[PDB]
Amino acid sequence: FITPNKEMRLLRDHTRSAIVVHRRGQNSNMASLSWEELERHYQRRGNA
Amino acid sequence: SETRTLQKIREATQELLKYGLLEEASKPNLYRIVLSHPEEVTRILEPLDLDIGIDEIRGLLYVKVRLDETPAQDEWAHPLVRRQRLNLEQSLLVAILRQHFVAWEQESGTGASQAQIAIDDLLPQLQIYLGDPGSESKERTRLLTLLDQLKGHGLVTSPDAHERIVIRPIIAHLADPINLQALLAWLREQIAQQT
Amino acid sequence: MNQVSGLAGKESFILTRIELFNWGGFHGLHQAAIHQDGTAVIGPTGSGKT
Amino acid sequence: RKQEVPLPAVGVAVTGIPAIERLRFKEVDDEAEQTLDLSNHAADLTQIGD
Ligand SMILES: Nc1ncnc2c1ncn2[C@@H]1O[C@H](COP(=O)(O)OP(=O)(O)O)[C@@H](O)[C@H]1O
C-alpha cells in the first residue's frame, strides 16, 4: 500500500513493515523498518 | 472532363510540400485559402501520411507526420521525411536563435513581430563556444554560410541589405527544444570551468 | 492474521525487494525491503512514493 | 555540351519533404569522468517532523 501518512492506524494492523520515504532538498531517501522499531523511535521522540 | 482540385488549393499544397510551411507574413493569399479549406488540404495530405499543424497565433502552417496514434512503434519512421542531425555549429546557432526568440516573446508577447537582429550581435555569442577561428573574414563567412544553411530549413530569413536577419515562426515548433537548452548550458559550463 | 499469511511465500512469488539507482529523486543507490506479510509505504506529500 | 534538351520529365521523384519534426540536434559526447559512487546512503536515518 501507498499512503501519504493517512490511515496509519489501519495499516499498522494489516502490515508488518513500513517504508518511510522523506524528502530533503532535491534528494529523496527511503528507510525500511518494522512497525515495532518505528514504535521504539516514537518512544525516543516521546522524551521531548 | 472530370473534377479537378481548385487551382489555388493545388498551388498551396504543392508549395506546402516544397518548402514545408506557409506564412501569412509572406504568402497571405495561399495561407488564408488553406485556412478557409482545412478539410480539403487534410484530405489531400492524408493518403501520404502527412498532415498540417496550424499555429494561428503566429500565422503559420507546417507539415508533420500523420502516422498512427502511438502504435507499437515508440518512434515514427516515414519514407519521404528523411531525418537529419545538424552538425555541432548548426546546433549551437539554432539554440542561440531559439533562446533569442523565446526571450523576445517573453516581453512583446506570443506572436509579436520579431525584432531585427544584426549579424554583428551574433558573432560575439558564437565566439563564446567556438573561440576565434583566426580572422574576422573567416568567422563572418562561417556565420553567413550557417545562416544560409538554416534558411533552407526555414528558421531564418536571408540577411537584408543592412545585415540583419529575422527569426521565422517555425523555430518555436522544433522537435525537442529541451535538447538545445541542455547542450547550450553544458558547453557554457564547460568553458566557464576551463577558464 | 498469520493463519492466512501462510499462503504468501508458499504458493506464489512475492515481491521482497526493490533497488533504485539515480531513479527520479533517488540519487546514488537505494533499496527498500518488502516484508512477505504485506508492506506499507508512508511519507509526506512529494517525497517519492509514486 | 551543357545545353538543356527538351526531353520530358518522367520518373519524377518527390522526396525529402522538409518536415520540421525531422531535425535532430548534435549529440556532443562527454568523456571526462565516470560517476562510480554507489554508497549505501546511510544518512537515511529517520528524522521527520512532529
Ligand atoms: N519526472 C518528474 N516529473 C515531474 N515531477 C517530478 C518528476 N520526478 C520527480 N518529480 C518530483 O519529485 C516528486 C515525484 O512525485 P512523488 O513525490 O513520488 O509523488 P507522491 O507524493 O505520491 O510520493 C515530486 O515531489 C515531484 O515534484
Coordinates of C-alpha atoms and ligand atoms in Angstrom, one line a residue:
Chain A
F1 CA 0.0 0.0 0.0
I2 CA 1.0 3.6 -0.6
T3 CA -0.4 6.4 1.5
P4 CA 0.7 10.0 2.4
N5 CA 0.6 9.4 6.2
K6 CA -3.2 8.7 6.1
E7 CA -4.9 5.8 7.9
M8 CA -1.7 4.9 9.7
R9 CA -3.6 3.1 12.4
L10 CA -5.3 0.9 9.9
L11 CA -2.0 -0.1 8.1
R12 CA -0.4 -0.9 11.4
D13 CA -2.9 -3.8 11.9
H14 CA -2.6 -5.5 8.5
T15 CA 1.1 -5.0 7.5
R16 CA 4.3 -5.8 9.2
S17 CA 6.8 -3.3 7.8
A18 CA 6.7 0.3 6.6
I19 CA 9.0 2.1 4.1
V20 CA 9.4 5.7 5.4
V21 CA 10.3 7.9 2.5
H22 CA 11.2 11.5 3.2
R23 CA 12.5 14.5 1.2
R24 CA 15.4 16.8 1.7
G25 CA 16.0 19.4 -1.0
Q26 CA 16.2 17.8 -4.4
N27 CA 17.2 14.4 -3.0
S28 CA 14.9 11.7 -1.6
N29 CA 15.8 8.9 0.8
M30 CA 14.0 5.7 1.9
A31 CA 14.4 3.6 5.0
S32 CA 12.7 0.3 5.6
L33 CA 11.7 -0.6 9.2
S34 CA 9.3 -2.8 11.1
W35 CA 6.3 -1.3 12.9
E36 CA 7.9 -2.1 16.3
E37 CA 11.2 -0.4 15.5
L38 CA 9.3 2.7 14.5
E39 CA 7.4 2.4 17.8
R40 CA 10.7 2.4 19.6
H41 CA 11.7 5.5 17.6
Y42 CA 8.5 7.2 18.6
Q43 CA 9.2 6.4 22.2
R44 CA 12.6 8.1 21.9
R45 CA 10.7 11.1 20.5
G46 CA 8.4 10.9 23.5
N47 CA 11.2 12.1 25.7
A48 CA 10.9 15.5 24.1
Chain B
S1 CA -13.8 16.4 -68.1
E2 CA -13.6 15.0 -64.6
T3 CA -13.4 17.2 -61.5
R4 CA -10.1 18.7 -60.6
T5 CA -9.0 20.2 -57.3
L6 CA -9.2 24.0 -57.2
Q7 CA -6.1 25.6 -58.7
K8 CA -5.4 27.7 -55.7
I9 CA -5.6 24.7 -53.3
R10 CA -3.3 22.7 -55.6
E11 CA -0.8 25.6 -55.6
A12 CA -1.0 25.9 -51.8
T13 CA -0.4 22.1 -51.3
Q14 CA 2.5 22.0 -53.7
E15 CA 4.1 25.0 -52.1
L16 CA 3.5 23.5 -48.6
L17 CA 5.2 20.2 -49.6
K18 CA 8.1 22.0 -51.4
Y19 CA 9.0 24.4 -48.6
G20 CA 7.4 22.7 -45.6
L21 CA 5.4 25.7 -44.4
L22 CA 3.3 28.7 -45.3
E23 CA 3.2 32.1 -43.5
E24 CA 0.7 34.9 -43.6
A25 CA 3.6 37.2 -43.3
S26 CA 5.0 36.4 -46.8
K27 CA 2.2 34.4 -48.6
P28 CA -1.2 35.7 -47.5
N29 CA -3.2 34.6 -50.5
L30 CA -2.3 30.9 -50.1
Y31 CA -2.3 30.9 -46.3
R32 CA -5.8 32.3 -46.0
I33 CA -7.1 29.9 -48.6
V34 CA -5.7 26.9 -46.8
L35 CA -7.3 28.1 -43.5
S36 CA -10.6 28.5 -45.4
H37 CA -10.5 24.9 -46.7
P38 CA -8.8 22.8 -44.0
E39 CA -10.9 19.7 -44.8
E40 CA -9.6 19.8 -48.4
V41 CA -5.9 20.1 -47.6
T42 CA -6.2 17.5 -44.8
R43 CA -7.9 15.1 -47.2
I44 CA -5.2 15.7 -49.8
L45 CA -2.4 15.0 -47.4
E46 CA -3.8 12.1 -45.5
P47 CA -3.0 9.4 -48.2
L48 CA 0.7 10.3 -47.9
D49 CA 0.6 10.1 -44.1
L50 CA 1.1 13.9 -43.9
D51 CA -1.0 16.4 -42.0
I52 CA -0.9 20.2 -41.4
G53 CA -0.5 21.6 -38.0
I54 CA -1.7 25.2 -37.8
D55 CA -0.4 27.9 -35.4
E56 CA -3.0 30.7 -35.6
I57 CA -1.2 32.9 -33.1
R58 CA 2.0 33.2 -35.1
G59 CA 0.3 32.9 -38.5
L60 CA 2.0 29.7 -39.7
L61 CA 1.2 26.3 -41.3
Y62 CA 3.7 23.4 -41.3
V63 CA 3.6 19.8 -42.3
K64 CA 4.0 17.0 -39.8
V65 CA 3.9 13.2 -39.9
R66 CA 0.4 11.9 -39.6
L67 CA 1.4 8.4 -38.6
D68 CA -0.7 6.2 -36.2
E69 CA -1.6 7.2 -32.6
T70 CA 1.3 5.9 -30.5
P71 CA 1.4 2.4 -32.2
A72 CA 3.7 -0.4 -31.1
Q73 CA 6.5 1.7 -32.6
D74 CA 7.7 4.2 -30.0
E75 CA 9.3 6.4 -32.6
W76 CA 7.9 7.2 -36.1
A77 CA 9.5 6.4 -39.4
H78 CA 8.4 7.8 -42.7
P79 CA 9.6 7.1 -46.3
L80 CA 9.6 10.7 -47.6
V81 CA 10.6 12.6 -44.4
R82 CA 14.3 11.9 -44.3
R83 CA 15.7 12.7 -40.8
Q84 CA 18.7 14.8 -40.2
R85 CA 21.2 15.6 -37.3
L86 CA 22.5 19.1 -37.6
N87 CA 26.3 19.4 -37.0
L88 CA 27.6 21.0 -33.9
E89 CA 27.8 24.6 -35.2
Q90 CA 24.3 24.4 -36.6
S91 CA 23.0 23.1 -33.3
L92 CA 24.7 26.0 -31.4
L93 CA 23.3 28.6 -33.8
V94 CA 19.8 27.2 -33.6
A95 CA 20.0 27.2 -29.8
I96 CA 21.1 30.8 -29.8
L97 CA 18.4 31.8 -32.2
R98 CA 15.8 29.8 -30.2
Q99 CA 16.7 31.5 -26.9
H100 CA 16.7 34.9 -28.6
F101 CA 13.2 34.2 -29.9
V102 CA 11.8 33.0 -26.6
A103 CA 13.3 36.0 -24.7
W104 CA 11.8 38.4 -27.2
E105 CA 8.4 36.7 -26.9
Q106 CA 8.6 37.0 -23.1
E107 CA 8.4 40.7 -23.5
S108 CA 6.3 41.6 -26.6
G109 CA 4.0 38.6 -26.2
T110 CA 3.5 35.4 -28.2
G111 CA 3.5 36.0 -31.9
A112 CA 4.8 39.6 -31.7
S113 CA 6.7 40.8 -34.7
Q114 CA 10.3 39.7 -34.1
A115 CA 12.9 42.4 -33.7
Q116 CA 15.6 42.5 -36.4
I117 CA 18.9 41.3 -35.1
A118 CA 22.2 42.4 -36.6
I119 CA 24.9 40.0 -37.7
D120 CA 27.5 41.8 -35.5
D121 CA 25.4 40.8 -32.4
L122 CA 25.7 37.0 -33.0
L123 CA 29.5 36.6 -33.7
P124 CA 30.4 37.6 -30.1
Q125 CA 28.0 34.9 -28.9
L126 CA 29.3 32.2 -31.2
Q127 CA 32.7 33.1 -30.1
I128 CA 31.7 32.1 -26.6
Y129 CA 31.6 28.4 -27.8
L130 CA 33.8 28.3 -30.8
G131 CA 36.6 30.8 -30.0
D132 CA 38.3 32.7 -32.7
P133 CA 39.0 30.7 -35.9
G134 CA 41.7 33.1 -37.0
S135 CA 40.2 36.2 -38.6
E136 CA 37.0 38.3 -38.9
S137 CA 36.9 37.4 -42.6
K138 CA 36.7 33.7 -41.6
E139 CA 34.1 34.0 -38.7
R140 CA 31.8 36.3 -40.6
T141 CA 31.9 34.0 -43.7
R142 CA 31.2 31.0 -41.4
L143 CA 28.2 32.8 -39.8
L144 CA 26.8 33.8 -43.2
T145 CA 27.0 30.2 -44.6
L146 CA 25.4 28.9 -41.4
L147 CA 22.5 31.4 -41.7
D148 CA 22.1 30.5 -45.4
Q149 CA 22.0 26.8 -44.5
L150 CA 19.4 27.4 -41.8
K151 CA 17.3 29.4 -44.2
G152 CA 16.9 26.2 -46.2
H153 CA 15.0 24.7 -43.2
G154 CA 13.1 27.9 -42.9
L155 CA 14.3 29.0 -39.4
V156 CA 15.7 32.4 -40.5
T157 CA 15.4 34.9 -43.3
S158 CA 18.2 36.0 -45.7
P159 CA 20.4 38.8 -44.4
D160 CA 18.8 42.0 -45.6
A161 CA 20.7 44.9 -47.3
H162 CA 21.9 46.1 -43.8
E163 CA 23.0 42.7 -42.5
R164 CA 20.1 42.0 -40.1
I165 CA 18.0 38.8 -40.0
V166 CA 14.6 38.0 -38.6
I167 CA 13.7 34.7 -36.8
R168 CA 10.9 32.8 -38.5
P169 CA 7.9 31.4 -36.5
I170 CA 8.9 27.8 -37.4
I171 CA 11.6 27.9 -34.7
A172 CA 9.1 27.5 -32.0
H173 CA 8.0 24.1 -33.2
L174 CA 11.3 22.3 -33.3
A175 CA 11.2 18.6 -32.4
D176 CA 12.9 18.7 -28.9
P177 CA 13.7 22.2 -27.7
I178 CA 14.9 20.8 -24.4
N179 CA 17.9 19.4 -26.2
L180 CA 19.0 22.9 -27.2
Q181 CA 18.9 24.2 -23.7
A182 CA 20.8 21.3 -22.3
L183 CA 23.7 21.3 -24.8
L184 CA 24.0 25.1 -24.8
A185 CA 24.2 25.3 -21.0
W186 CA 26.5 22.3 -20.9
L187 CA 29.0 23.9 -23.2
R188 CA 28.7 27.2 -21.4
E189 CA 29.5 25.4 -18.2
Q190 CA 32.5 23.7 -19.9
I191 CA 34.0 27.0 -21.0
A192 CA 33.4 28.6 -17.6
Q193 CA 35.1 25.6 -15.9
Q194 CA 38.1 25.7 -18.2
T195 CA 38.6 29.4 -17.8
Chain C
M1 CA -3.7 -13.0 10.9
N2 CA -0.8 -15.3 10.3
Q3 CA -3.2 -18.2 9.7
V4 CA -3.9 -16.7 6.3
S5 CA -0.3 -15.4 5.8
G6 CA 0.8 -19.0 5.1
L7 CA -0.3 -18.5 1.5
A8 CA 2.4 -15.9 0.9
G9 CA 5.9 -17.2 0.2
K10 CA 4.5 -20.8 -0.2
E11 CA 2.4 -20.7 -3.4
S12 CA 3.2 -17.5 -5.2
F13 CA 6.1 -15.2 -5.9
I14 CA 6.2 -12.3 -3.5
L15 CA 8.0 -9.0 -4.2
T16 CA 10.6 -8.8 -1.5
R17 CA 13.0 -6.1 -2.7
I18 CA 13.2 -3.0 -4.9
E19 CA 16.5 -1.3 -5.7
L20 CA 17.0 2.0 -7.4
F21 CA 20.0 3.9 -8.8
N22 CA 19.6 7.5 -9.9
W23 CA 15.9 6.9 -10.5
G24 CA 13.9 10.1 -10.1
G25 CA 14.9 11.8 -7.0
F26 CA 16.9 8.9 -5.6
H27 CA 20.5 9.8 -6.2
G28 CA 23.0 7.1 -5.8
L29 CA 21.9 3.6 -4.8
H30 CA 18.8 2.8 -2.6
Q31 CA 16.8 -0.2 -1.6
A32 CA 13.6 -1.0 0.2
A33 CA 12.8 -4.3 1.9
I34 CA 9.3 -5.7 1.4
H35 CA 8.0 -7.9 4.2
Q36 CA 6.4 -11.0 2.8
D37 CA 3.4 -10.4 5.1
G38 CA 2.4 -7.0 3.5
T39 CA 4.2 -3.7 3.5
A40 CA 3.0 -0.1 3.7
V41 CA 4.7 2.9 2.1
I42 CA 4.4 6.2 4.0
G43 CA 5.8 9.7 3.8
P44 CA 4.7 13.3 3.4
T45 CA 3.5 14.8 0.2
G46 CA 6.0 14.9 -2.6
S47 CA 8.5 12.5 -1.1
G48 CA 8.9 10.0 -3.9
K49 CA 6.5 7.2 -3.1
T50 CA 5.0 7.3 -6.5
Chain D
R1 CA 27.7 20.3 -74.3
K2 CA 25.9 21.7 -71.2
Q3 CA 22.8 23.0 -73.1
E4 CA 19.5 21.7 -71.9
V5 CA 17.4 19.5 -74.2
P6 CA 13.6 19.5 -74.5
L7 CA 13.2 15.9 -73.2
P8 CA 10.2 15.3 -70.9
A9 CA 10.1 14.7 -67.2
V10 CA 9.4 11.0 -66.5
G11 CA 10.1 9.2 -63.2
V12 CA 9.8 12.5 -61.3
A13 CA 10.8 11.6 -57.7
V14 CA 9.3 13.5 -54.9
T15 CA 11.2 13.0 -51.6
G16 CA 12.8 14.9 -48.8
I17 CA 9.7 16.8 -47.7
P18 CA 11.1 19.3 -45.2
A19 CA 9.0 18.4 -42.1
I20 CA 10.4 20.5 -39.2
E21 CA 10.0 17.5 -36.9
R22 CA 12.7 15.6 -38.8
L23 CA 15.5 17.7 -37.4
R24 CA 17.7 16.3 -34.6
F25 CA 20.4 18.2 -32.7
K26 CA 24.0 17.4 -32.3
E27 CA 24.9 14.7 -29.7
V28 CA 28.2 16.1 -28.3
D29 CA 29.7 13.3 -26.2
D30 CA 31.3 13.6 -22.8
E31 CA 34.3 11.6 -21.7
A32 CA 35.8 13.4 -18.7
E33 CA 35.0 11.0 -15.9
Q34 CA 32.6 8.4 -14.5
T35 CA 30.0 8.5 -11.7
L36 CA 31.2 5.5 -9.7
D37 CA 29.7 6.5 -6.4
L38 CA 27.1 3.9 -5.2
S39 CA 27.5 4.4 -1.4
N40 CA 24.8 2.9 0.8
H41 CA 23.4 6.4 1.7
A42 CA 23.4 5.7 5.4
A43 CA 22.2 9.3 6.0
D44 CA 18.6 8.0 5.6
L45 CA 18.3 7.7 9.4
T46 CA 14.8 8.7 10.5
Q47 CA 14.4 12.4 11.4
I48 CA 11.0 13.6 10.4
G49 CA 8.7 16.4 11.6
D50 CA 6.5 16.1 14.6
Ligands
LIG1 N1 9.6 13.1 -13.9 C1 9.0 14.1 -13.0 N2 8.2 15.0 -13.5 C2 7.6 15.9 -12.7 N3 8.0 16.0 -11.4 C3 8.8 15.1 -10.9 C4 9.4 14.1 -11.7 N4 10.2 13.4 -10.9 C5 10.2 13.9 -9.7 N5 9.4 14.9 -9.7 C6 9.3 15.4 -8.3 O1 9.7 14.5 -7.4 C7 8.3 14.0 -6.7 C8 7.7 12.9 -7.6 O2 6.4 12.7 -7.2 P1 6.1 11.8 -5.8 O3 6.7 12.6 -4.6 O4 6.7 10.5 -5.9 O5 4.5 11.7 -5.5 P2 3.9 11.3 -4.0 O6 3.6 12.5 -3.2 O7 2.7 10.4 -4.2 O8 5.0 10.5 -3.3 C9 7.6 15.1 -6.7 O9 8.0 15.9 -5.5 C10 7.9 15.9 -8.0 O10 7.8 17.2 -7.7

